[PDB]
Amino acid sequence: MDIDPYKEFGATVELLSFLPSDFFPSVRDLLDTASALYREALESPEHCSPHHTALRQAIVCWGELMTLATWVGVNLEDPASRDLVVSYVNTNMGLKFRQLLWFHISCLTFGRETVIEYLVSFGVWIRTPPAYRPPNAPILSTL
Amino acid sequence: MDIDPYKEFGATVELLSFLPSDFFPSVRDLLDTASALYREALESPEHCSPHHTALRQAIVCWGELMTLATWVGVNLEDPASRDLVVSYVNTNMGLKFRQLLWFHISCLTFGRETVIEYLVSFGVWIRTPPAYRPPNAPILSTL
Amino acid sequence: MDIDPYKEFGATVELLSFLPSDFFPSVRDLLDTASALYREALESPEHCSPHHTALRQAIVCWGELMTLATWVGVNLEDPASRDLVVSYVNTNMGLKFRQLLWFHISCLTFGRETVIEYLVSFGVWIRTPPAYRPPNAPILSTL
Amino acid sequence: MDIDPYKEFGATVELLSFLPSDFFPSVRDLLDTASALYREALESPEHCSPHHTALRQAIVCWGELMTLATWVGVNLEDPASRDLVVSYVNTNMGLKFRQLLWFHISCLTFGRETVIEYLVSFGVWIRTPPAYRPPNAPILSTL
Ligand SMILES: COCCOCCOCCOc1ccc(C(C)(C)CC(C)(C)C)cc1
Numbered sequence: 001m002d003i004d005p006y007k008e009f010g011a012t013v014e015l016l017s018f019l020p021s022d023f024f025p026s027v028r029d030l031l032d033t034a035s036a037l038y039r040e041a042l043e044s045p046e047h048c049s050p051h052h053t054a055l056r057q058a059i060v061c062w063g064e065l066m067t068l069a070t071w072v073g074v075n076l077e078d079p080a081s082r083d084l085v086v087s088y089v090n091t092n093m094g095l096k097f098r099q100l101l102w103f104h105i106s107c108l109t110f111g112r113e114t115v116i117e118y119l120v121s122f123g124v125w126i127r128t129p130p131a132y133r134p135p136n137a138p139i140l141s142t143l
Numbered sequence: 144m145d146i147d148p149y150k151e152f153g154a155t156v157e158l159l160s161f162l163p164s165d166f167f168p169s170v171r172d173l174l175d176t177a178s179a180l181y182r183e184a185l186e187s188p189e190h191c192s193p194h195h196t197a198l199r200q201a202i203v204c205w206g207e208l209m210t211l212a213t214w215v216g217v218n219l220e221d222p223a224s225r226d227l228v229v230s231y232v233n234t235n236m237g238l239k240f241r242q243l244l245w246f247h248i249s250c251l252t253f254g255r256e257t258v259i260e261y262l263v264s265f266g267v268w269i270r271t272p273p274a275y276r277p278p279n280a281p282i283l284s285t286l
Numbered sequence: 287m288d289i290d291p292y293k294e295f296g297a298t299v300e301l302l303s304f305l306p307s308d309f310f311p312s313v314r315d316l317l318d319t320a321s322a323l324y325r326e327a328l329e330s331p332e333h334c335s336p337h338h339t340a341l342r343q344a345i346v347c348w349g350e351l352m353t354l355a356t357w358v359g360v361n362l363e364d365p366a367s368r369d370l371v372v373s374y375v376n377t378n379m380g381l382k383f384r385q386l387l388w389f390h391i392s393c394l395t396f397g398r399e400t401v402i403e404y405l406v407s408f409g410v411w412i413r414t415p416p417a418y419r420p421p422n423a424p425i426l427s428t429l
Numbered sequence: 430m431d432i433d434p435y436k437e438f439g440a441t442v443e444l445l446s447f448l449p450s451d452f453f454p455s456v457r458d459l460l461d462t463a464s465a466l467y468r469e470a471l472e473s474p475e476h477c478s479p480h481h482t483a484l485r486q487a488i489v490c491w492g493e494l495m496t497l498a499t500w501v502g503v504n505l506e507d508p509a510s511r512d513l514v515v516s517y518v519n520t521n522m523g524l525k526f527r528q529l530l531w532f533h534i535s536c537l538t539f540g541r542e543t544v545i546e547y548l549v550s551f552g553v554w555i556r557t558p559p560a561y562r563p564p565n566a567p568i569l570s571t572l
Pocket residue numbers: 005013057058061062065091092093094095096097099100200203204205207208
């Protein structure tokens with residue numbers, strides 16, 4: 001239905017299109033970050049924020065995908081296709097899942113405005129060729 | 144994190160378990176409804192409601208699952224494994240997807256409170272033995 | 287029962303597992319620190335702080351564990367079983383003990399809130415990729 | 430270091446030595462008493478009292494020792510060593526644990542002052558030879 005999961009929050013798939021894949025932590029790392037920083041709120045009966053809502057939904061999706069992967073490994077007799085499906089799920093879907101988790105966690109942490117500014121600046125940086133861009137990328141940190 | 148996607152909305156997997164699985168409409172039907180009634184709001188850059196947020200996330204996840212099914216039908220060779228994966232995706236993941244779509248669309252349309260009352264009333268109905276179970280099952284209506 | 291030795295201090299086993307196990311100093315190092323810095327207060331007849339109380343209890347428990355290990359070395363004959371017991375103690379219970387000692391000493395020294403923020407920040411740091419995190423690991427300092 | 434876990438509260442190991450070792454109720458009984466009277470306070474995120482702070486740590490230590498005992502019963506195939514270790518734990522560590530539990534549960538139920546007066550009076554009673562010792566020993570009570 002031509003839905004962008006970030007347009008509601010002030011971003012776009014094209015704005016995060018520039019962040020490389022090596023930029024995002026692993027799924028386990030991001031899920032641990034969430035479970036340690038906002039678990040009491042995600043497991044809460046309150047609409048603490050749209051970021052919380054989206055995180056809840058995406059975590060449920062990922063749980064269902066892991067269930068799918070287990071079911072595949074248990075019910076498919078062709079190892080080739082089994083590993084192919086599992087690899088597609090992990091690589092692609094987890095890349096998207098990392099994108100979304102990072103966006104929402106970083107927003108909850110720093111600010112939606114700050115994260116969008118960081119995205120703009122990081123796009124400026126990554127579009128520049130290495131011969132003319134500084135070697136050290138921009139950094140979003142609590143320290 | 145053990146997250147319930149309805150806890151914030153005032154329900155639970157136990158309160159929706161009152162409804163059978165053969166109750167929820169088709170994914171096609173629910174998506175047509177969602178389009179016809181809230182396309183401009185779901186495509187909007189606004190947190191119109193947590194229901195809208197959750198519904199957007201669910202729809203993007205279903206789109207990714209359809210992409211997975213297509214990628215499977217293309218790449219995978221073993222017809223048994225292809226059909227197994229596609230049928231599992233559709234049946235199970237779409238059962239859950241329709242559950243969620245029904246909940247959120249019905250809420251947006253009638254009321255979260257109305258939908259929870261409908262859940263308890265349908266529980267009463269389905270628990271009533273057939274000898275005394277009226278045929279006029281409960282149904283949501285604006286009239 | 288379901289007791290967390292950290293919740294009164296505003297932390298959790300989930301938050302202290304958010305840091306690696308190879309990060310926490312040795313039992314000897316932490317006990318030397320505790321002595322040098324708070325021996326007169328831990329050997330005092332005052333509830334100087336809940337940190338002091340918990341640390342006293344932990345140290346007495348570790349002393350009883352050391353007595354157990356010596357008693358094992360003496361009485362037990364099977365060297366395999368003896369070594370296995372002593373190793374279990376000094377590894378598992380040692381890790382737990384030094385996590386707790388680190389928490390409480392670092393709190394007494396820098397601040398409970400400072401230490402919790404440090405846990406969060408160091409976890410996010412060691413989970414973030416190097417090219418996009420600051421290059422130097424976080425550390426607590428009174429200087 | 431030389432830490433007495435009672436002088437923080439107003440007692441010593443020499444004062445509680447007035448009571449014999451066969452005086453203290455079993456770990457089962459004392460843990461049931463605690464679960465009955467102060468479960469919600471021990472499981473609370475509050476420094477309700479130093480007695481709570483100490484009892485929490487003691488119970489955590491006891492849980493770790495029980496884990497050790499089960500791990501022993503599993504991984505050790507020398508019944509002699511298994512039994513030796515489990516018996517040592519449940520006897521010596523059990524005695525110390527139930528001393529501490531008695532002290533703290535009593536000081537929570539009655540008070541530091543009442544419990545110390547009780548210790549002194551019971552010392553009188555027990556140092557008194559039996560030919561001149563009343564049968565109605567001192568017995569803590571609110572009635
Ligand atoms: C292979 O991925 C490359 C990066 O993605 C490019 C387009 O980005 C759009 C991302 O859109 C989504 C879609 C779905 C999702 C959810 C939360 C539903 C999770 C998923 C991918 C596990 C189904 C997240 C982001």
